[PDB]
Amino acid sequence: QFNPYGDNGGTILGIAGEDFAVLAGDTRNITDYSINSRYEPKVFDCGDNIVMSANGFAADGDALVKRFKNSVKWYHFDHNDKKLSINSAARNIQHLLYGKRFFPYYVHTIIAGLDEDGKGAVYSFDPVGSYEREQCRAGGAAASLIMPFLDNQVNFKKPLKYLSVEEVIKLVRDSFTSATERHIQVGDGLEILIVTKDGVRKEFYELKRD
Amino acid sequence: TQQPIVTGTSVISMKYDNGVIIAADNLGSYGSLLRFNGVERLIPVGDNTVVGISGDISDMQHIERLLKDLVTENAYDNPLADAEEALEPSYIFEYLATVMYQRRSKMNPLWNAIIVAGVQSNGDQFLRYVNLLGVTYSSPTLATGFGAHMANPLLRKVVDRESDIPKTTVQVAEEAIVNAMRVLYYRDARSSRNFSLAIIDKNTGLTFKKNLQVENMKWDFAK
Amino acid sequence: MQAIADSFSVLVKELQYDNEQNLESDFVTGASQFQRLAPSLTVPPIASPQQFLRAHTDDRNPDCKIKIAHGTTTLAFRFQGGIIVAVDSRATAGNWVASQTVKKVIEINPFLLGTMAGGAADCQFWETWLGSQCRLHELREKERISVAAASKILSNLVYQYKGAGLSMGTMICGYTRKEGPTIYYVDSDGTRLKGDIFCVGSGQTFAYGVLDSNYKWDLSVEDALYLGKRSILAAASVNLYHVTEDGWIYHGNH
Amino acid sequence: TSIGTGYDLSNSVFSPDGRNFQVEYAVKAVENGTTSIGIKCNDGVVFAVEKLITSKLLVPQKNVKIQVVDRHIGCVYSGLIPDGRHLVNRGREEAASFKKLYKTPIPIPAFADRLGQYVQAHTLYNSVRPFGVSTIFGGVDKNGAHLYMLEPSGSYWGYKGAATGKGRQSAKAELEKLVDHHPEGLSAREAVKQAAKIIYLAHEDEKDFELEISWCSLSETNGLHKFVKGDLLQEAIDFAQKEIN
Amino acid sequence: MFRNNYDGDTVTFSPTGRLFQVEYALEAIKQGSVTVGLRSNTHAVLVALKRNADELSSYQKKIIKCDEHMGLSLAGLAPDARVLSNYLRQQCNYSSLVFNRKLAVERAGHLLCDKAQKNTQSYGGRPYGVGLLIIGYDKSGAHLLEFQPSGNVTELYGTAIGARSQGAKTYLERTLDTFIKIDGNPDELIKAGVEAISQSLRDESLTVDNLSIAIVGKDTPFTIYDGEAVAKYI
Amino acid sequence: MNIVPQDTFKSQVSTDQDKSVLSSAVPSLPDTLRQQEGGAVPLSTQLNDRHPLESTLKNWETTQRQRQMEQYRQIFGIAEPMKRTMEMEIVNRTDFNPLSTNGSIHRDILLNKECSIDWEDVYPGTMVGDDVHSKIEKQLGI
Amino acid sequence: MTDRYSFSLTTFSPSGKLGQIDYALTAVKQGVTSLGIKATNGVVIATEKKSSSPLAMSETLSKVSLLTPDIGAVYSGMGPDYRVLVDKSRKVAHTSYKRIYGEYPPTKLLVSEVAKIMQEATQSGGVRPFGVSLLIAGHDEFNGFSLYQVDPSGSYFPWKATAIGKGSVAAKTFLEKRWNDELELEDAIHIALLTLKESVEGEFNGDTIELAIIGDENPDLLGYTGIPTDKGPRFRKLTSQEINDRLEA
Amino acid sequence: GLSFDNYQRNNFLAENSHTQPKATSTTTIVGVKFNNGVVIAADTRSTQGPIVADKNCAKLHRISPKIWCAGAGTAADTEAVTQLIGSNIELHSLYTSREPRVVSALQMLKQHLFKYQGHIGAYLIVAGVDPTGSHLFSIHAHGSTDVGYYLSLGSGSLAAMAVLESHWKQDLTKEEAIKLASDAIQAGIWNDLGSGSNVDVCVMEIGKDAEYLRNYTP
Amino acid sequence: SAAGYDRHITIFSPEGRLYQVEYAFKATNQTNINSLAVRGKDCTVVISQKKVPDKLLDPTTVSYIFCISRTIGMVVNGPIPDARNAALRAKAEAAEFRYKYGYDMPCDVLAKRMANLSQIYTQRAYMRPLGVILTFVSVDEELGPSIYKTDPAGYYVGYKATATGPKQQEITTNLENHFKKSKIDHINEESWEKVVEFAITHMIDALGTEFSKNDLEVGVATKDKFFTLSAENIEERLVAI
């Protein structure tokens, strides 16, 4: 019996601010105990100030991102180049994921952007389609090493609402450095995309594997 | 299919300051039997693309047929096929990755590992890897099979990161590739002594070398 | 004859793009994939799709596993003039921070409610689909859809895929003018029951006993809400929903 | 009688004399098209087309009347432009399929047979229409040089020299005179000059025109199909002008 | 009288050898307004004069964006224009999705010709009755194509189609070398196009409501100017 | 160029895949009453536990016909398969016999089965449907 | 879509008559004469072998064909329709009966199948009715010998003696006065020869007329021996030599 | 064609409480070719498992009056396939107005057996004569055919093959061929428990009617 | 001329006739060329008349004789497009018969198959008959030399000898007179070259005014192979009377 699935590791993290969103991921693609690539981005700018990242089976994530981008292009064609909201994108991704209910994608999905009011918004998707809006979400085989760090160094009830973008970037960098120290899979780089009303900004940091 | 029957072993590729270099040995093994000698596993597509395929030989020939069909259809009906309307390596890799993923989703995959190497029109090097599951990735050095475990560290010692690409001349990359092929012939049972090499350079074009043999063998440390 | 000539004229075959479904699903010819009232579900092209799915759904990333709605206690009863639906808001530990309470109850319409008690994705997707179907029916007939009709539609839908791998058990509660207040239970095995009192979850025998102790038709809104809250507490942060002919009203703890 | 009433409003219908009038109407439509000729020399073929002058807004290098089907096949047509384009596309597909399957350039007789079968298949049903084009094509294969002409009825023949269009009669007379004057053989360059002369003679009706010539010969083009450079084209034009007056 | 007996459909020839239905489809182009297209070595532009039903109505959209590097303007029937624009969008989307390759202007013209020819030889489908002007920018530079619904495509430096379009064509022919050598100055080319289309006006003046412009270039993606965006060119 | 049929499995499923038999009250769901299959036959049961030879036998002459058409295209050109398919389609479309299922003589002549017998010929094998009007609607597409 | 249907070729006239069927009958009446005579020991089927060209080999074309080892047929009308119908009848005799009941069909059932096939062409959208008339002679265990005539409309009737073709009326008049319940197979053959003698305008010998008989079994024609229960074929086509011998006598 | 209905029901019954009734599985079959024809012989004893069911079984099947065959394996499958091919052969001979050939029957049988991918359990020995001569072939249930001079099949095929290897030569007469086939069947009867009783013989010679003999030994 | 319908499709006229079939039959004589087929002792010879009015036409590309298979040859009377269509269909049918039944296709079976196809064309309303007459010649392994002719009406028949064309009556009468004189249904010659010479002489004395090597086309079928003669072979046969 041919096995159509696989695993490529990787860790992603999405945080929602008061007027911005952050989506970061480690840029290392690895097979079982071997490094395929030391720089392979997993977070993409999927159109109208929306960042998307599917972690797990790389081929499934690439296919899902490609399908979503084509759907966004046809959405712009159909409705006078109307801007696609984050909740509509979330429902589109839910339908895309559930369309393969009996042959599921082996990915966990996180998207980030700004809602209608202007606050940061992060949506999390299980492989079959179920989604919900969260303030912070960590996916991959480092979440148990990243979430307690964030809970210790910040409160979601220093409240998260008063944080600036630089403080969030610093917290993400520190958590990923700690995970890199503790976890073998995590390392070799960290790419962060910040979504604000001005657009999407990209930053890169080198982790402890070169 | 369910498993390869006649199989190739490894393809190794590296980036240097002006282009890319790829190499693969000429052998088709029938299980533990080294059956066919003289199997070309590097396919030159266009004047600037080289595709290296490792794995099932029948699927490799099928992919060769697909590449030839693509090249023939490109000239239909472009009168500038040799001109700026040629096939970029990105187009070929996108088509091949789409085919591999579609066949994987159909439960009838092509048991191959494919490395596409070349130089774009603007002069940017292109080097990508795809497999039977449709997993695609890029790196300054790429390899398949036992090359991914033995030749990869040797190549990464030369081109460690993206900043080291402009510092690597073609001579250094070619020497490293030859040494990696020698190591593979040393420590791979299904490997072969004869191999082919391809250099794609934005100035000198495509250089294809055949009937290259592993030399400088060290066996005297026995008795 | 032109189509026949083109069929025998020569890449697309390997891409499988000569088929309409592949082009539609990849959004090549337009956004017609997102325009199907009845969604199309991908099935592996093998002789044993069900066994394949069952084998691959029990194998090990915690994030890449199908989320299952927790077996929390859910209660529903119709006393005199509405339906009380009571759930317990006891969140589960995870690697995330929630901006609001977990939505353990699906709001089908301003007049219909449902419970998950199964797979989260299946319940959400198919209850949204049921809401769309009910909206279309109400537009066509110019009248609110009966709760029996909605429950029957959902039951037929889940029966068409019986044995494929779906796992969902829902309680459709609704108050119509012709029928009054009605509660149906629809299971993924095609089961469809009509009842006055429903209790489900990890612990529901205690809640059912508490209800049977102090249940009567001649209750009031406040008495019914207190009874539901007491039953949920005894079965153990109690979310309440009161459904009347004008729709459903939500109470966090009152 | 060239107008058969009661037997000319549908495609696949026999007249009481046993004639298909839709095919004859297609031939009449062909006869009003531009004049194109082809000459078969000793080791190749030469194609000549009279091109009507048009607006200066057209890109000179993106509007060529002589179509190339394969590297060793040249083709011209007279009649309806869409039908000619459709037939050229079918011929390119056939040549590509043959080369892919049998790993050799398709022989001219086999290509002609496939094209003729495709054309004739459109005269069997009342839901289609006969091709309103007559096609003169040719090339070089292992057997030598071949030149063929194909009609709307699906009937094709090999010719020493072929001509179609408005000025077909004068061109045919000139071709017959050339054949009589060269019973042993004709060279490629002499064929080009004679094609230019015939094209210039065929324009007896007011309107300025240009000339397009194309070669396909082993000695000159190494078996491929090429157009004419500036020097040879200018020489042919000057020779034609000298012959005119 | 004799023409009346042989114009039933596209599978019938006249005794003189004429296909009258395709000719009628070609004649249907004149019922639309005038559109002009013109290109230089760096940019290609389209100018359209839109029409409204009455005072209370809106104006027709005569310029349609097909891809970030290719667009077209219409003259003739609405249904066939909609169908052909959707077909071109689908072709561009397929090319980008499968090859990550921008569809060439010549390839789009060839695909349109192949699609349009098949309706002029079969039974049950009328020929298309819309002329199209397609501008694009690809690896071969700037391109302008004129598509005639008989199944014909011509490559030219400038042209105009629609009702009373002969004046614009004559103006473009006369001032050819003047507008050809306009590189890196899109405004000059747009002004030349507006001046060319002004020759086809009859008891009408170009306003912000009935004027539409489209432009594509080396670093300029296909952009459409409507309303106040064209007020500077009036 | 296939000898044994391939790709006989479904890739997608839906509740409205059978366009002929759909409910009118809920057009997105099938009509169980007019299916007349037994009343307890979900579509999913058709995706599992099938005889391996059933697919091979059900589509066998079609595979040979397709291989023959491919050979004709490779050797003769497009015209030969085009003409064969055109003739077969004309013969199939002209015939309409709601009271019989046996094929026409001309179809067998075109298929070259004038003097050939298989188990399909020997074995050619309600409250609702199976009448003339249903077949008329199916044929005309109304 | 207008391509999903085709209007019926055969339609009722205002007088209530299907024009295509009547025209098919007219075409039948212009064909060569064939006849059949039923006797107590067998049935004789006879016809005239027309020949447009004298260089044609008369034995290559046979207007009398073996349907089953006990059932034969002759036609009047269009030859290609006869050939197609004979092939179809031979196929149906095996698909419908022998592969089911393990035995060959009776004469009446085979005639009914042929008539149904012929009728299906008169209510169609693109095939004209068959322009042939059929005389089928057979034998079965439970009904003895039988002779049937099948019209282009698909109607079949049993006959004691009948004739179709150009001279059908004269042949029927002759056979009305030369038939009785005590007739024998040899007498029937002689009467058929006499009736055909009055219809052939040209040369009348064994190479211009064709005859066949349904009589007793012919075990020498089976091709194998050893099974007593395997009855030999009863249909036998008379050779030209036998026809010449009977003409001389 | 053949129905696949009640397949799942039969599997459920087999897996839960019921046993499917068995099918008769047919026993020596031999074919010997002599200078002017062929002889096909078979044993006449059929046993239902360990119990003898009949002492006179006709296992010789007829395809054409001069083309015969004997089959082993599933008896129903053998009979049905032979009858279908015989009907096809009769129709083809009527269509061509010519004597049927052994190669045509071989081709039909091979293609039909390859269609069902071995699910039809019929292993055949087909002998016959035609205008081209005398022919003898062996056909496997998966659709593979072989050509030979003497062939044996069935449970007692090894003893029959030993006898054939002992006493076969190129130049043989009709009586010698019949005796050799009878001896092979007798050896299969005596040295194996799957064969017994009498022998059915069919002799086909060039230019003569086929001769069928039942109970040749008495 | 048909009154109402029958100008388009093949249905019965009030007289009970198919006018389209008759018009297709009339269309077969447009080429104004004649063909003659005769049988030898162990061979069959077909001879056709070549006309090249246009001096620009290449004579080598003009032919109406086709090689259907190794043993069967075909001669077509009528327009060349339908001729080539029928030739390709005959090739396909013969190859399919060989694949399906395991032995070579006889001439009469192929003629009957083409006749059945013609019957399909004559009965279907949306199909038209091919205006050609086909003559298959071979040497069957069970019947010796064989000639079979099929017409657009769906009728096929074998001939001892035959001739078709605008002047077929003269050749047919001459052949009938020769057969009556010699009292043999074939030619008593052991070599195909003599049969070819006899057929050439018969054609010469039937049509008249003789002809040269460029005005003839000869095909010979033996028990092994069917082949078509070239200009040199025809000229050498012409030399020998």
| G14 exposure class (CB count in 10 Å sphere: 0-12, 13-18, 19+) | exposed
The tokens for E196 are: 């060319």
| Chains E and H are touching, with contact defined as 3 or more CB–CB pairs separated by less than 8 Å | no
Residue D91 neighbours by CB under 8 Å, 6+ apart: D69, D73, D75, D111, D115, D137
Q: How far apart are CA D96 and CA H79, in angstroms?
A: 51
3-class secondary structure, D16: coil
The reply to whether residue H91 touches residue F60, judged by beta carbons under 8 angstroms, is no
CA distance D82 to chain E (A): 6
Residues 105-164 of G with CB under 8 A from F: 117, 120, 124-127
- F37 in reach of chain C (CB within 8 A): no
Residues from chain D contacting residue C3 (CB–CB below 8 Å): none
Q: In D29-72, at which residue ranges do the beta strands (DSSP E only) sit? A: 36-41, 44-52, 67-70
H runs (alpha helix) in chain I: 19-26, 80-101, 107-123, 168-182, 192-207, 231-239
To test the contact with chain B by mutation, choose from D69, D87, D100, D103 the residue with the greatest count of B C-beta atoms within 10 A, namely: D100
What technique solved it? Answer: cryo-EM
How many CB atoms neighbour CB B222 within 10 A? 4
Domain assignment present for residue C216? The answer is yes
D122 in contact with F at a CB cutoff of 8 Å?
no
Q: After which residues is chain I broken (C to N over 2.5 A)?
A: none
Alpha-carbon A145 to chain mean position: 17
Question: Which residues is H135 bridged to in the sheet?
Answer: H128
Neighbours of chain A (3+ CB pairs under 8 A): B, C, E
How far apart are the C-alpha atoms of F4 and G97, rounded to whole Å?
32
End-to-end CA distance of chain B: 47
**Unique residue bearing structure tokens 């157009």:** D227
Residue A27 touches partner B, C-beta closer than 8 Å: no
3-state secondary structure of A30: strand
- The Cα–Cα gap between F85 and F70 comes to 12
Of C62, C77, C104, the residue nearest C196 (C-alpha): C77
In which element (H, E) is residue E216 found?
strand E211-217
Sign of CA dihedral B150, B151, B154, B159: negative
DSSP tag of E227: G
Per the listing, tokens 């052909």 go with: E84
- Report residue F119 as tokens: 């188990």
Whole-number Cα distances in Å, E178 to E39, E183, E188, E218: 12, 11, 10, 20
CATH topology (fold) of B1-223: Glutamine Phosphoribosylpyrophosphate, subunit 1, domain 1 (3.60.20)
Q: Do residues D205 and D213 lie in contact, with contact meaning Cβ atoms separated by under 8 Å?
A: no
**Which residues of G are less than 8 Å from H95 in CB distance?**
87, 90
Neighbour-count burial for B80-89, b at 16+ CB within 10 Å, e otherwise:
ebeeebbbbb
What CA–CA distance (Å, rounded) separates G57 from G35? 23
Q: Helix or strand or coil: residue A156?
A: coil
Candidates B69, B70, B102; nearest CB to C16: B102
Phi and psi, residue C114, nearest 5°: -145, 160
Structure tokens at E23: 């000719």
**Which of E98, E99, E110 comes nearest B77 by C-beta?**
E110
Distance of alpha carbon E25 from alpha carbon I53, whole angstroms = 42
Q: Could you tell me which residues come within 8 angstroms of residue G208 by beta carbon, excluding any fewer than 6 positions away?
A: G48, G49, G51, G58, G200, G202
Of C15, C44, C46, the CB nearest to B98: C15
Residue from H27, H44, H47, H82 carrying the catalytic annotation: H27
For residue D223, report the phi and psi dihedrals to the nearest 5 degrees: 85, -5
Q: How far does chain I reach from its first CA to its final CA, in angstroms?
A: 47
C-alpha of F123 from chain center: 16
Torsion from C-alpha of I53, I57, I59, I64, nearest 10 degrees: -80
| Conformation bin of residue E193: beta by default, left when phi > 0, alpha when psi is -120 to 50 | alpha
Surface of D (89-118) touching I: CB under 8 A: 109, 113, 116-117
**D94 Cα to chain C: minimum distance (Å):** 9
Q: Is I97 helix (H, G, I), strand (E, B) or coil?
A: helix
Amino acid at G152: P
Q: CA Rg, chain A, in Å? A: 17
Residues I125, I103 contacting (CB under 8 angstroms): no
CA proximity to H132, closest of H105, H101, H109, H89 = H101
CA distances from D37 to D163, D168, H129 (A): 4, 8, 64
E20 C-beta neighbours (distance < 10 Å), count:
17
What is the distance between the terminal CA atoms of chain A, rounded to a whole angstrom? 38
Kindly name the residue from C29, C42, C72, C74 that is annotated as catalytic.
C72
Distance from CA of D224 to the nearest CA of F (A): 24
Token digits for I121?
């064309």
Contacts of B99 in chain C (CB under 8 A): 14-15
Q: What is the DSSP string of chain H?
A: ----TTHHHHHHHHHHT--PPP------EEEEEETTEEEEEEE--EEETTEEEES----EEEEETTEEEEEEE-HHHHHHHHHHHHHHHHHHHHHHTS---HHHHHHHHHHHHHHTTT-S-EEEEEEEEETTEEEEEEE-TTS-EEE-SEEEESTTHHHHHHHHHHS--SS--HHHHHHHHHHHHHHHHHH-TT--S-EEEEEEETTS-EEEEES---
- The residues spanned by each domain of chain B are 1-223
Q: With contact defined as beta carbons under 8 Å apart, do C72 and C87 qualify?
A: yes
C72 catalytic residue (yes or no): yes
Q: Is B167 helix (H, G, I), strand (E, B) or coil?
A: coil
Which residue, among A53, A79, A96, A26, has the nearest Cα to A195 in the 3D structure? A53
**CATH level 2 (architecture), domain A1-210:** 4-Layer Sandwich (3.60)
Q: Is the alpha carbon torsion for C44, C49, C52, C57 positive or negative? A: positive
- Strand, helix or coil for residue E229: helix
Domain-embedded: residue C9: no
SS3 G35: strand
Task: Tell me which DSSP letter residue A136 carries.
Answer: E
Characterize the bridge pairing of strands I65-67 and E130-138: unpaired
Q: Measured between alpha carbons, how far is I240 from F68 in angstroms, rounded to an integer?
A: 48
Q: Show the domain range for C113.
A: 72-254
What DSSP character marks residue G97?
I
Give residues with Cβ within 8 angstroms of H175, minimum separation 6: none
Active site residues of B: 1
Going by the DSSP 8-state scheme, the letter that residue A207 receives in this structure is -
Question: Phi and psi at residue G148, in whole multiples of 5°?
Answer: -130, 150
User: By CB neighbour count within 10 A (0-12 exposed, 13-18 middle, 19+ buried), where does E173 fall?
Assistant: middle
Q: Is I38 helix (H, G, I), strand (E, B) or coil?
A: strand
Of the candidates G63, D62, H110, I171, the residue with the CA atom closest to the CA atom of residue E144? D62
Q: Which of B1, B133, B144 to mutate to test the interface with A (most CBs of A within 10 A)?
A: B133
Kindly give the residue spans of alpha helices, DSSP state H, lying in I142-239.
Answer: 168-182, 192-207, 231-239
What is the dihedral sign for C-alpha A33, A37, A43, A44?
negative
Give the span between the Cα atoms of C168 and E202, in whole angstroms.
70
Give every CB contact of residue G175 below 8 A, 6+ residues apart in sequence.
G35, G37, G161, G162, G163, G191, G195
In a domain, residue C57? The reply is no
Tokens found for residue I126:
């949306």
Residues of I in contact with F72 (CB under 8 A): 92
Whether residue C235 lies inside any domain: the answer is: yes
Q: How far apart are the C-alpha atoms of E131 and E152, rounded to whole Å?
A: 10
Residues in chain I, overall count: 241
Measured between alpha carbons, how far is A16 from A119 in angstroms, rounded to an integer?
8
What lies within 8 Å, CB to CB, of A190 at 6+ separation is: A24, A25, A26, A27, A172, A173, A176, A204, A205, A207
Alpha helix ranges (H) inside chain G: 19-29, 79-92, 99-101, 107-120, 168-176, 185-197, 240-248
CA–CA distance, A196 with A19 (Å, rounded to integer): 7
Q: How far is G60 from chain H (nearest CA, A)?
A: 10
Chains H/I: 3 or more C-beta pairs closer than 8 A? yes
Q: Is the peptide bond before B77 cis (omega within 30 degrees of 0)?
A: yes
Task: Please give the torsion angle defined by the CA atoms of residues C18, C24, C30 and C33, in that order, rounded to the nearest 10 degrees.
Answer: 170
Side chain identity, residue E22:
V
Q: SS3 of G28, please?
A: helix
* Token pair belonging to B15: 């980036």
- Tokens 């039942």 -> residue: H214
Burial I171-206 (b: 16+ CB within 10 A, else e): bbebbeeebeeeeeebbebeebbbbbbbbbebbeeb
Q: Among positive and negative, which fits the CA dihedral A186, A187, A189, A192?
A: positive
Chains with 3+ CB–CB pairs under 8 A to I are: D, F, G, H
Determine whether the interchain pair E93/A66 forms a contact, defined as Cβ–Cβ distance below 8 Å: no
* B139 interfacial to chain A (CB closer than 8 Å): yes
Q: G227 φ, ψ to 5°?
A: -115, 105
Residues 6+ apart with CB under 8 A from H109: H81, H85, H124, H126, H139, H145
The number of C-alpha atoms within 13 Å of F76 and in the hemisphere containing its C-beta is 24
Nearest residue to C76 (alpha-carbon basis) of C224, C236, C233: C224
Q: Which of A152, A158, A188, A164 is nearest to A25 (CA)?
A: A188
User: What CA–CA distance (Å, rounded) separates F69 from F66?
Assistant: 5
Q: Are H41 and H201 in contact (CB under 8 A)?
A: yes
Cα separation, G86 vs G67, in Å, equals 7
> Which other chains touch chain E, taking contact as 3+ CB pairs less than 8 Å apart?
A, B, C, D
Give residue I132's identity as a one-letter amino acid code: V
G19/G29 Cα distance (integer angstroms): 15
Q: How far is D92 from chain F (nearest CA, A)?
A: 12
Give the bridge partners for A193, in sequence order.
A23, A202
The position carrying tokens 């070169």 is A210
Q: Which domains does chain I have, with CATH numbers?
A: 4-241 (3.60.20.10)
Using an 8 Å Cβ cutoff, are E163 and E36 in contact?
Answer: no
Cβ–Cβ under 8 Å, residues E52 and E59: yes
As a whole number of angstroms, the distance between CA F98 and CA F133 comes to: 9
Radius of gyration of chain B (CA): 17
Domain ranges in chain A? Answer: 1-210
Interface contact E122-D63, CB threshold 8 A: no
| Residue B10 one-letter amino acid | S
Cβ atoms of residues G9 and G127 within 8 Å: yes
Which residue type, as a one-letter code, is found at position C57?
Answer: T
Domains of chain E, first to last: 4-234 (3.60.20.10)
Angle at G185 between CA G182 and CA G188, to 5 degrees: 80
Q: What is the CATH number of the domain that holds C132?
A: 3.60.20.10
Whether residue C20 lies inside any domain: the answer is no
Residue C109 lies in a domain: yes
Q: Which helix (H) or strand (E) holds C203?
A: none
In the numeric block, which tokens belong to residue A172? 């993400």
Per-residue CA distances from D119 to D23, D24, F82, H200 (Å): 11, 14, 12, 63
Tokens representing D199 are: 């094209």
List C-alpha distances in Å: D2 to D7, D22, D28, D130, I32.
Answer: 12, 11, 10, 18, 20
Q: How far is CA D62 from CA A135, D84, E106, E144, in A?
A: 59, 17, 10, 11
Structure tokens at G41: 């020991």
Does the annotation place C86 within a ligand binding site?
Answer: no
Compute the residue count for chain C.
254
Check if the beta carbon of residue F90 is closer than 8 Å to that of residue I126.
yes
Domains of chain G: 1-249 (3.60.20.10)
Comparing CA positions, the residue from D140, D147, D235 lying closest to residue D197 is D235
Residues of C in contact with B61 (CB under 8 A): none
| CB pairs D-E closer than 8 Å | 96
Query: What is the number of other CB atoms lying within 10 angstroms of the CB of residue H121?
Result: 21
Residue I172 tokens, joined: 């047919």
Tell me how many domains chain C contains. Answer: 1
- Cα C237–chain centre separation: 22
Alpha-carbon distance H172 to nearest alpha carbon in chain I (angstroms): 28
Q: Cα–chain-centroid distance for residue C20?
A: 31
Structure tokens at E82: 């909609």
Tell me how far apart the alpha carbons of residues I90 and H76 are, in angstroms, rounded to a whole number.
Answer: 40
DSSP string covering F18-87: -SSS--SSSTTS--HHHH-S-S---GGGGGSS--HHHHHHHTSHHHHHHHHHHHHHHHT-SHHHHHHHHH
